[PDB]
Amino acid sequence: MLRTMLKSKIHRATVTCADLHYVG
Amino acid sequence: MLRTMLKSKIHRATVTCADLHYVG
Amino acid sequence: MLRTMLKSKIHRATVTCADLHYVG
Amino acid sequence: MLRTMLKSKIHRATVTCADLHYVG
Amino acid sequence: XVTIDADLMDAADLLEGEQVTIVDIDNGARLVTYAITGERGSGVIGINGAAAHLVHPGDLVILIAYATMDDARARTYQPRIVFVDAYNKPI
Amino acid sequence: XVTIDADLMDAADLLEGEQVTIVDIDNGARLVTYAITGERGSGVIGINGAAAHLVHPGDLVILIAYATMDDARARTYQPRIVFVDAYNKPI
Amino acid sequence: XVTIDADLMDAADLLEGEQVTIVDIDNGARLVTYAITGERGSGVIGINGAAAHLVHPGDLVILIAYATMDDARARTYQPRIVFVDAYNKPI
Amino acid sequence: XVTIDADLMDAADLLEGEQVTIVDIDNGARLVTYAITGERGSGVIGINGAAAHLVHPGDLVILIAYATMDDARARTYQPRIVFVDAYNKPI
Ligand SMILES: O=C(O)c1cnccn1
Ligand SMILES: O=C(O)c1cnccn1
Ligand SMILES: O=C(O)c1cnccn1
Ligand SMILES: O=C(O)c1cnccn1
Numbered sequence: 016m017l018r019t020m021l022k023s024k025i026h027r028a029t030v031t032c033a034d035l036h037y038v039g
Numbered sequence: 040m041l042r043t044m045l046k047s048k049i050h051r052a053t054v055t056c057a058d059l060h061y062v063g
Numbered sequence: 064m065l066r067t068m069l070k071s072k073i074h075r076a077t078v079t080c081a082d083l084h085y086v087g
Numbered sequence: 088m089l090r091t092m093l094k095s096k097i098h099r100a101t102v103t104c105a106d107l108h109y110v111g
Numbered sequence: 112x113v114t115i116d117a118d119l120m121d122a123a124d125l126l127e128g129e130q131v132t133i134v135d136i137d138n139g140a141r142l143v144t145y146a147i148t149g150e151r152g153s154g155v156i157g158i159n160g161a162a163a164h165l166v167h168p169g170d171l172v173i174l175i176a177y178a179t180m181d182d183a184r185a186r187t188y189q190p191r192i193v194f195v196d197a198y199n200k201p202i
Numbered sequence: 203x204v205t206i207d208a209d210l211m212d213a214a215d216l217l218e219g220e221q222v223t224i225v226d227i228d229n230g231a232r233l234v235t236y237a238i239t240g241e242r243g244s245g246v247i248g249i250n251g252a253a254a255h256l257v258h259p260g261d262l263v264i265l266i267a268y269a270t271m272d273d274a275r276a277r278t279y280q281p282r283i284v285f286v287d288a289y290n291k292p293i
Numbered sequence: 294x295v296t297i298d299a300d301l302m303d304a305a306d307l308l309e310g311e312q313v314t315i316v317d318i319d320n321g322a323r324l325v326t327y328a329i330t331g332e333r334g335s336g337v338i339g340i341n342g343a344a345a346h347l348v349h350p351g352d353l354v355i356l357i358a359y360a361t362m363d364d365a366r367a368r369t370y371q372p373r374i375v376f377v378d379a380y381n382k383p384i
Numbered sequence: 385x386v387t388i389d390a391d392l393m394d395a396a397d398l399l400e401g402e403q404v405t406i407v408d409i410d411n412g413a414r415l416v417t418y419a420i421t422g423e424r425g426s427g428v429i430g431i432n433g434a435a436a437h438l439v440h441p442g443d444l445v446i447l448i449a450y451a452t453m454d455d456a457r458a459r460t461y462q463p464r465i466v467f468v469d470a471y472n473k474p475i
Contacts, residue, residue: 039420045266
């Protein structure tokens with residue numbers, strides 16, 4: 016039996032930018 | 040072949056508190 | 064490398080009942 | 088320990104058609 | 112949760128407690144729940160609990176289960192796809 | 203995230219950090235988060251962070267954990283189902 | 294479900310029935326469905342069933358597949374990334 | 385997708401291409417995307433593509449990755465939890 020566990024958390028980071036039309 | 044199966048259920052619990060700005 | 068694949072599909076079934084307050 | 092990783096991406100495809108009442 | 116006629120569960124290769132995605136053709140709702148075995152041949156598709164807010168009696172739905180499988184098996188695996196009449200009986 | 207009474211976590215076989223699905227009977231919200239151990243016997247069900255927008259104190263919720271398991275074990279596995287009173291104590 | 298041009302499926306290393314996430318650049322919809330093989334070189338991206346409520350013809354979409362893989366392989370794995378022209382032909 | 389400062393990815397044990405859940409403390413949005421490595425020490429948290437409809441510049445977010453692991457390892461595994469200042473630098 017395999018459980019799904021938290022491994023990574025970045026807590027209360029601030030979004031610095033957003034691009035709808037990103038290419039990558 | 041791995042299936043995703045119910046393992047845990049807490050049925051009809053009452054939410055007692057909430058914190059939007061939790062740290063942990 | 065494991066892929067996530069369709070294994071089961073019930074196509075265009077009709078919902079017969081709904082119970083918000085089901086216990087089970 | 089298994090991670091979920093990106094394996095496939097089709098970037099900025101155009102949806103050509105849609106069928107609400109598809110059978111398949 | 113979702114109560115499914117045992118015949119459709121056998122036809123679709125679903126176990127009691129197996130995770131199931133319900134998608135609603137009528138209202139576009141999409142949720143994840145688990146299968147409960149319903150009375151065999153009754154054609155029951157029963158939405159239980161919180162899901163009843165999103166998926167309503169009379170709605171046309173698709174029930175989907177996925178599996179994780181090694182590349183080799185993934186290329187050869189045949190999914191169990193069940194078409195049903197207006198009374199939820201297999202065709 | 204969700205802070206759960208250690209008694210409910212033991213009863214439901216949940217570990218700290220185990221992925222949990224919360225479904226809200228009151229508002230139909232459905233989200234994925236992880237379990238945090240709450241003060242034992244306090245009956246705490248605490249919604250922490252962004253989830254607090256969707257799931258509110260006083261709401262009736264179902265907390266669900268899934269496991270990935272080989273076909274053989276999936277057919278035989280018995281889930282841990284915990285019923286609770288209005289004070290979040292097991293029955 | 295999503296019908297994809299067999300050329301894009303080969304280019305992206307997708308199998309018929311492989312789970313696919315569709316994200317809609319136009320309306321911000323995000324859903325999970327599976328790949329169906331479409332007529333090769335037709336540039337078809339067809340949204341089938343309940344998903345058609347959320348993702349519409351003319352919309353720019355990103356189609357994503359994930360894999361579960363052991364830590365060692367995860368650190369080295371190179372995903373298949375397919376760029377396409379306005380006619381859904383690979384570049 | 386989400387561009388993350390390489391320092392936060394190392395701190396959180398995230399790989400380029402690893403599936404990531406973003407939850408928005410400001411607007412309650414919840415989505416699944418993958419990590420892209422951002423300029424080290426820049427404190428970049430960049431929302432790319434469709435996700436920009438849901439998660440906006442200035443929003444406080446939590447970035448989460450989960451792993452599937454055998455019962456024994458699950459009970460002993462220590463998750464990498466990174467607290468950050470207003471400039472996205474670890475504490
Ligand atoms: O009430 C529901 O909608 C529900 C219950 N258990 C699991 C998933 N969903
Ligand atoms: O803030 C939340 O709602 C949250 C936090 N961590 C994991 C999942 N969800
Ligand atoms: O109709 C849909 O949107 C659908 C169908 N099968 C699987 C996933 N989604
Ligand atoms: O544009 C997005 O939001 C996106 C792109 N790739 C993967 C997941 N999400």
